[PDB]
């Protein structure tokens, strides 16, 4: 005797895992591929006539450096980062799009702001004592001072 | 490895947030004294498809463009512009040879590849009858350096690793080669 | 990414439970965001004055020596 | 605000304070190193780093039995 | 690897936890329309602790011996 | 530390004070005033002004001491020898 | 000797060649001093922070003010949302300034 | 209209998928409840819930709703504080570890090397949301449960940590997804039997399930921590461990069951050559199929930690620190020792590829 | 806007205003989190999960000893402060927070770049745990000396017998 009135809320949680994978095996996919089409609406959206038929793109997964590497490549190259292009040769674009991520390098504010953590011998010389800065300024001031010779 | 750098792009904008990373663009090309050179414009799975066909064909040019580079004590980049354009050149003849002759094989494997996370593990079949089409109209074999001719694992004819999803366009085009070309 | 979720939540129950207290450094916080995105450069003439009264190389003080050195080179050639 | 130690206000009125006042100082000089070398791409000193985790982390067990003995202590008649 | 799609979850995650809160604040029936016995600060019956039935000595911060601290 | 910090003199004073609080029969209380005679207390008031000298010195009579004592002179001396501060929290001596 | 600068993939990182040639002049017994290993010492220490470099680039900055130049018609042109790296921007013959998809590769 | 809303959609896409995932693991949740006294009647020979919706249907609902219809008790309403912060922290512990639970390959919504650290440390903070409510509080049965949490979490912590290790050094991957991938050919279950009962009965202590239920043993602390709880804060913990439950679950299934990998690779074959890959059908079927084989699997543990609940009695929290530290830790350390040898000695060390 | 900046400003006026011990470990927690999420963007993920595998367990256990010693002493001992006097002395130290006075360094922007000779890319963990085990093993196993004497120590101080 199997009752089925037990097996009801095991088949609506199995639903419940369908729903996530469903949607999101689909969706993914379907996002990847539209993007892939070209660097503008009219193709993502509109599909030509003499087209063939669609072929899908699965999400990537355990990605290294290289992989990211590719992706701002492809990018350059198709206007998405899983663009799809087996040309032999490239746009004239692709020579000056180069993309050079130029950022800061300072401490973690919490390393600065911390009430606590900011306190230590070599913090408060870096902060109020000059006889780092000074010393290393002379470097900075010898590159202008030996231009002339 | 998704370990943030300052080279390329991070895992998220809230990344480039922290970091104020501002994304810079060049408007120069390169001085009219280093001669142009057209650059590859295959994507990625279009590259990992022929990698081991670029290798075969410009083996000569891939070593000698890396011998300069090693010789060259550190000014790797400026010495070695003429070796670095005859390797462009040798790989988009690959590919360029690729489209006129293996265009249906190709491409039938690096959409496999896009289909399958980029492994080469998942797309045997594909490769298989790319592996033919090239060596009979370019006489360029895949091989797998340091090993035995017999050892290598896309030769192999029972892998323990195989793919959990078949590509359909593969099995289709692998079942009428088989039938076909092995009467 | 923890206080990603937790923030929404730590700041809504510090003003149920002390609204002044959070105002005053709520407002602090914004009052130092809109210098910086306005560029009204209060906090620039703070670090100013403090690197100026502790003797560390200042932003006028580095571009004072380049003047003097571009007047010395220029009379050198001249 | 540093010089005229600030930092001594922030402290509890507890010994267990003391003990949060340290990890919270030696882990700011954990934070610098990963800054270090996350910046110079250097893995030495991330190996430095995850060395004055678990070091660290030796020093609060010490402390906290230490601690725990000298409750102990006060509390040790246990005639009942 | 891109981590946008995980920024936007941590997000809702942190937003959906004050939901379930902010729906019990203003789902529930004020006061008045139940019995009406006031506010729950002045209900100090209710917001008393819990002894089963009986109260006794309060040691809120009286010391607690733990036979497991060497573990 | 942990030490007493009374003087004869002190303790004397706020024992003065404490036994003014009640109706006794002569304000001038010193070190000979007995509580029966001088200051006209029965059982239950006695017992009343040493628990009330108790509460100001954070000390405790025992049953025998509190029994046989006649004078103020005797509370006095009681307070001085048994007195003691109360043990703080570890928090409190160490930080 | 113990290897330092060690690169996020277990070889040497951009510094190390630097730091390299530095050893390697120190530990030559033909110098008599340490005068002539001075010049590495500065480009390893150039490696790393990049302190006079950037000292270079706040004269340009500061220069370039004083000459009433607009910071936008000598600089280069950038962008800061990751998203908005549009096809338009990478110069794609049909490019779009449509923004461009980040979430998920 | 019209082309202004089929870019809004693409605008906000990725958000309705967050939103559907979301709504996956709630229904789950929201059902085991329900479940569990289904199958706790049928063992112990009543119903269960049949009478709130059809079929009992809506058992659930009813149970969040009234209670979200509940007055909250606290000393005064500023205290809104001390009754929530600990229920939240406990919910956004246990949320936050479904980002790297793949429902697929790459169906993630937080993909890294590192996901193995991730889910183990965002786990080790809900612990943290449990001691909270014994906030210096006056309620002596709040008190001694906070004592037996933080007992609990001692026993199973060194424990369930090294058996995930085991799998990682195994995988010699950190990266969940290349764990379910490595189980192609083998699933763990076979080679690593014991582990997979180890990590079981530290997944029952973890989420304080019996019978390790020390920390809200009716029949000792009334009501544990929650005894002072009512309407929002009892449904976040109440929540939170309900979640906890199907994350271990699924949990166990990954690690030894190959995760969402089909139990017949013939029969997966067969259902999707149905389907054209040409159409966004296939992958509407591949992924129900994928994520319907690690609901399988889930399911059987959530009906395990059901089926042991009617099954055993309640042991002492101090006779569970001397099972954990005396046997379950000699083992594991043990297997730890043992696994690197027989895969040095056939020169089988394992690579990421 | 840099939301850091907020948090910090929160966990500093609660560090000033903290009286009993609760509130003294609750400041821990209420800074390890701002280290893991800082630490999680920008810099390193790899030691933002550590953090939070390590300390968090510390915490628990820095918890359950805070049980055993609450004696009601700041319960009701009184703190005087001031509203204004908090405000005033957290808005000087928001003045100042250049932890170095190198401003080119601080306001120059630099970048790197990539190159393709690491065909073998593997995480940052793998290259720690290639040179720990490999290049400074002895560092790694005088660290297990050290993990045995705190057991040896722990057991000692803490025994009554
Ligand atoms: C599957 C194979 C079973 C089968 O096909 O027929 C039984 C089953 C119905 O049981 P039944 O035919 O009425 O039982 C025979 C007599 O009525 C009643 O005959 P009985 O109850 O006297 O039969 C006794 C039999 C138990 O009855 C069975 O044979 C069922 C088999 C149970 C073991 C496998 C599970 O033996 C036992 O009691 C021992 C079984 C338990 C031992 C421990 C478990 C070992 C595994 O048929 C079905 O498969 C349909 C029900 C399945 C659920 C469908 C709806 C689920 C809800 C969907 C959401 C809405
Ligand atoms: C925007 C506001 C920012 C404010 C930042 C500072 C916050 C207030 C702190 C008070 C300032 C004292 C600290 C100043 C920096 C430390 C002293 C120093 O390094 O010298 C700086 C100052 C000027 O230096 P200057 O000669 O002009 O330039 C350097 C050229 N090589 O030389 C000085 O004369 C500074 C004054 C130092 C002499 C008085 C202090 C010493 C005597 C009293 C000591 C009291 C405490 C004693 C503790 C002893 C403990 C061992
Ligand atoms: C929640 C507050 C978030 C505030 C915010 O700035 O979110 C910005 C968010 C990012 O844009 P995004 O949706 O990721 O674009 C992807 C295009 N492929 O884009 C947004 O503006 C998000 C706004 C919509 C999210 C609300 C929930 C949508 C689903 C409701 C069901
Ligand atoms: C995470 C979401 C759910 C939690 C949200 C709770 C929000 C409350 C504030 C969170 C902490 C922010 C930083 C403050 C440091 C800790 C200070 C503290 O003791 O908690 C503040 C709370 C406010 O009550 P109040 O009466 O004003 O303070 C006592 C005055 N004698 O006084 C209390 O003692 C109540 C403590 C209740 C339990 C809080 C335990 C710590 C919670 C940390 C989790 C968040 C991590 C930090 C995030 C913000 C970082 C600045
Ligand atoms: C296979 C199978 O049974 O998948 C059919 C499913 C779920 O069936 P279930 O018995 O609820 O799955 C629970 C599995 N247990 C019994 C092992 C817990 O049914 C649907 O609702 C679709
Ligand atoms: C999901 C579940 C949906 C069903 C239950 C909804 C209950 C909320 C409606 C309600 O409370 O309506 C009654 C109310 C006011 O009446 P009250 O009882 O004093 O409000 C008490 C609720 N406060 C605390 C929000 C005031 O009317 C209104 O003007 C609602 C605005
Ligand atoms: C969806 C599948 C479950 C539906 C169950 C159901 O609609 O349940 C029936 C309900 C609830 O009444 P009940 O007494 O609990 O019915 C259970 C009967 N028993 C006791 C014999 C088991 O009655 C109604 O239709 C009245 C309300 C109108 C419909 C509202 C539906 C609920 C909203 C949320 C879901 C859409
Ligand atoms: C304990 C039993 C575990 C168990 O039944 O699971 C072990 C096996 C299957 O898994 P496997 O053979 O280990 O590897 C995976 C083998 N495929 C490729 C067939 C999935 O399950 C059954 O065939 C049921
Ligand atoms: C072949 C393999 C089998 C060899 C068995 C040898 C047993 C020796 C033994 O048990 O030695 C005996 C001693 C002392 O025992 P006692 O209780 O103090 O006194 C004995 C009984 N009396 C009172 C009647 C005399 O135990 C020990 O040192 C305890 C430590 C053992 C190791 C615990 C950690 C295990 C980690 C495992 C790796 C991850």
Known sequence: MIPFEALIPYAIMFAGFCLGGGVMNSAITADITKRARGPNQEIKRNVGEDEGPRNYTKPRYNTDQWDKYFAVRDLRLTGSLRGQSDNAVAEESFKTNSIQPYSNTRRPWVLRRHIIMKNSPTKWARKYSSRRDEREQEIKDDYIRGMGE | SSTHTNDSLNSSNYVDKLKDTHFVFENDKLPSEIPDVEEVGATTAPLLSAAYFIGAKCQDYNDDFMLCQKEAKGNGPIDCLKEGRRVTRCASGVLKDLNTHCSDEFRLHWQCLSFSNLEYKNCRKAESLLNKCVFEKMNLVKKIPGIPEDRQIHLKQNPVLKPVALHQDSEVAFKKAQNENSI | PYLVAFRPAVLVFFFIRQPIGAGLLAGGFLFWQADRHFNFGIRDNIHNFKQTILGFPTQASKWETFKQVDAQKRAQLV | MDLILLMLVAVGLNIIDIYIMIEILIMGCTVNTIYSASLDNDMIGLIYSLIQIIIAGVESAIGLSILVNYNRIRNSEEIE | ?71 | QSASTLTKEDVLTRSVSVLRGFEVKTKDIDLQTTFVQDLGMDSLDLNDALVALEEEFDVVFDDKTANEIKTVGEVVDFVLANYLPTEQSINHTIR | APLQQVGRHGGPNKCFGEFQRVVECMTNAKHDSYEPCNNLKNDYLECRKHKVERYKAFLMQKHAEELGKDPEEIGAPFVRKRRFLTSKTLGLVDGDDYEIGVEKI | MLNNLFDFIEYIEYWLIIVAFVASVLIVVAYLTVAERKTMGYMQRRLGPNAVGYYGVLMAVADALKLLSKEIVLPHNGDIIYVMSGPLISLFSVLLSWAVIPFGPGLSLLDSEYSIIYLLASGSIGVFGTVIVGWMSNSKYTVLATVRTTAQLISYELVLTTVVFIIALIVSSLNINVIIESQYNIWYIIPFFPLCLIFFISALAETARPPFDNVEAESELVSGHMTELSASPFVIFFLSEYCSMVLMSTLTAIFFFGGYLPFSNTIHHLILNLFDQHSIYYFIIEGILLSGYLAIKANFFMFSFVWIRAAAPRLRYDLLILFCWYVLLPIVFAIVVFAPGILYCFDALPVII | MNLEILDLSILGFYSLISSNSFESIAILVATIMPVITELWYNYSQLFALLYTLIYVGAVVILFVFILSVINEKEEYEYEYSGLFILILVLLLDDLDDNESNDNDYNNVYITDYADWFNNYNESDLSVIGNLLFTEYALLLLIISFILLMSIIGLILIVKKD
């Open chain 5, 1 to 71: 690897m891109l981590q946008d799609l995980f920024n936007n979850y941590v997000i809702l995650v942190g937003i959906l936890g004050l939901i379930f809160l902010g729906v019990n604040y203003f789902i529930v029936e004020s006061p008045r329309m139940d019995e009406n016995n006031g506010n729950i600060s002045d209900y100090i019956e209710k917001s008393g602790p819990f002894e089963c039935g009986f109260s006794s000595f309060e040691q809120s911060h009286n010391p607690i011996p733990i036979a497991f601290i060497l573990v």
